[PDB]
Symmetry: C3
Subunit: 294 residues, 3 copies
Amino acid sequence: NDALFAGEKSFPVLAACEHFAGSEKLIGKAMDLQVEYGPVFDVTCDCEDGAAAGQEREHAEMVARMIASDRNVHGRAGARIHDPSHPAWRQDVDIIVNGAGGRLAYITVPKATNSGQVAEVIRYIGDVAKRAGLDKPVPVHVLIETHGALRDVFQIAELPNIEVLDFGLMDFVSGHHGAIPAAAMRSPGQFEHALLVRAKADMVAAALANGIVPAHNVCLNLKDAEVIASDACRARNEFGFLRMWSIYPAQIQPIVNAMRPDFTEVEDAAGILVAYRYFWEVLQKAKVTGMAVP
Amino acid sequence: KSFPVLAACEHFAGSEKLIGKAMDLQVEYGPVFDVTCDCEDGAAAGQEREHAEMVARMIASDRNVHGRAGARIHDPSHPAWRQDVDIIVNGAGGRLAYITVPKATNSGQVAEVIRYIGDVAKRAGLDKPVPVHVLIETHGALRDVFQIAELPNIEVLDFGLMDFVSGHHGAIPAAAMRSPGQFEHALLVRAKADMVAAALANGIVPAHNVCLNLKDAEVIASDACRARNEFGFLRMWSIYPAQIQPIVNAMRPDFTEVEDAAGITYRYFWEVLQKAKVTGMAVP
Amino acid sequence: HPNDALFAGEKSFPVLAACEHFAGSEKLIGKAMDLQVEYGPVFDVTCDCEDGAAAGQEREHAEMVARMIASDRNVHGRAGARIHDPSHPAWRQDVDIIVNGAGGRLAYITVPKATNSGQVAEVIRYIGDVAKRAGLDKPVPVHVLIETHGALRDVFQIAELPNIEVLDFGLMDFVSGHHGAIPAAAMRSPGQFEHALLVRAKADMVAAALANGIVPAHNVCLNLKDAEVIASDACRARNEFGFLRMWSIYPAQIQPIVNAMRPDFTEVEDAAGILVAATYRYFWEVLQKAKVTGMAVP
Ligand SMILES: [Cl-]
Ligand SMILES: [Cl-]
Ligand SMILES: [Cl-]
Ligand SMILES: [Cl-]
Ligand SMILES: [Cl-]
């Protein structure tokens, strides 16, 4: 099915959910939850929020060790590095790429203010990956959470090895000199404010135009499954997001289930393929979201 | 530059039988709608020259009374698109109203097809260039919509909802391919509004995709009204004859508006009077 | 030690009045300047040349505008002028007369109907030349109308041009360029906040303005005296689109626009507290917004 439709770039088949963990304890717990739930979600080892004042070297070292370890069973653990303006972002790249033991799933690049910063970070990851003897390039996840990154979203989406564009609602709103009220940083405002609709739709349009998965910001409700599912459904059905971040384990199953294809849709997709392109995407989405494939 | 005064409706017909019937319906109704002879959906699997040769003959024939018959050729990646242009431009007897270009994935493909149409039209001894209708129905064509709208001889930008949605790796649900979703989904609002903004910025008519309801006049009228009054579309495609009159009437200027337009800023009122004529209304 | 000198790695966001009142005659300019004395500089005054000036009275009208702006009547120095568009034969003459005449009190120049980035850049460069020759130390701030297809297409390029402090949304002229595709009903509320082309245009301009530390300003309310309707338009522009200013064409529109644009009383109380103990750039913007909108600063 893959060898029969390939004149074009293959769309990445990625988990509907990306769970964040900053500490060794929470990274381990998340990796263990992947064993429990199946790789229905990816784990991002956070450096940007996780690393302390002057503990950047120690923290990236722990992250690299955690990703390289036997604890990382499914190899679906990536890392969020510091932003391109932070002096430790290169050091994070170097420590994690050289130390990850080739198990590094991706690198998440936050707070870039333009296409140039992203290109520089991807170029650097590539140089470090080459220098480490890595065969395949390290996939990159790029945050779109600044004015410049949104303005340059179509240029960013054309950069090499990007598999995800992440919408950063909080940092995006903070840059608007108080023109976007706080109420718009919560639902339903985040799907209705003209600037946020514009930003989300531009990001998704740029991502999908370039075979990139568009990923949605977290739900601020940590434990109410119905509220988490509602945000994931609005993001999936009204904007075209195919992935969503998680900051609390209770958020994973509602995100995965909201992003899942219909049971009858996958049944039909397998039958048609028993013999297209669309139905193959549906069957691949069903496997990645932990559903039974016929 | 004068804005193009085009019929509010564009009816599609793939077979000789349906092309003929559509041309006869233009005689019945008046040229309130254009006819697009469809080589893209209409042509058989490997009978592209035979079909193009039928289309050219139908457009050149006496049966085409109002000279408001264009053709939709194959997409720029299809091996028969140049052959469709060769056969239809050289064979149309100079009656060819326009060429509809579908599924272009970038500005380059559109420019190439326009350039080729121009070359064939010049060699065929055509005085005026063949007007072009460009489908915006891919990621690349939407990304490049402002660049496409600046290309020469384009008089229409057509929104291709179905092919546009199909390229979204299932991110746009099936419910959005129909009303009210096709006018409310953030990606579809964005795509439609970008296309209309690009078209109107360059004196091009923005045209809307078909209504999937073939015979219910109220549902067809509703789609044509939303596309006209919420998005700025000035034309809409038809795939069934029963869709023509609801589309034309939904796009018509207000009776009092035309009465005031005749009693004559002036470029606007002139556009209204010309719209009233093209839409088969009584001009005072 | 001051809040302004403590944050300078970036450009400071302009602290402008929530309202901009237009007046085209000497009488109405006078009255608007007097109303700034009565209300406080909670609103700016734009001396309209563009609409104000008669058939061949462009020089005479710009001379009156310059005289009014330079006069003792202009107490708060919050009086700008709208010159003619870049295609108009009097725009340079308006700049010459008003800049050389304003006695250094000119608050800004409003540039209308530009059809591209190049026209805007040309007008700004010309204002700069005249400002420097008139002995002005600081450049004359510019307000640019986004009311054409070309200016909307080039909005991000326009927003990068020097000395722009406001991007104005010109609904009426923007709609008139759409060959009747935007109906008249969309030129009023709720259509002007809901028509796909208008949402797109307004959101693009606000996004371009805010991306470049420029204040996005909203078009007038066509209801001249109903405070509830004026407040409603100011609130939709403020809370759904991110506009931080709005035009006024009738004095009764000023207070509803200012009040709709005001920060919450508790928000300013907190902003003063955080800043005294001293994110801070946000709370500083809120405290400055409170002063410019005539609220009591703690
Ligand atoms: Cl750009
Ligand atoms: Cl299942
Ligand atoms: Cl369609
Ligand atoms: Cl005078
Ligand atoms: Cl206006």
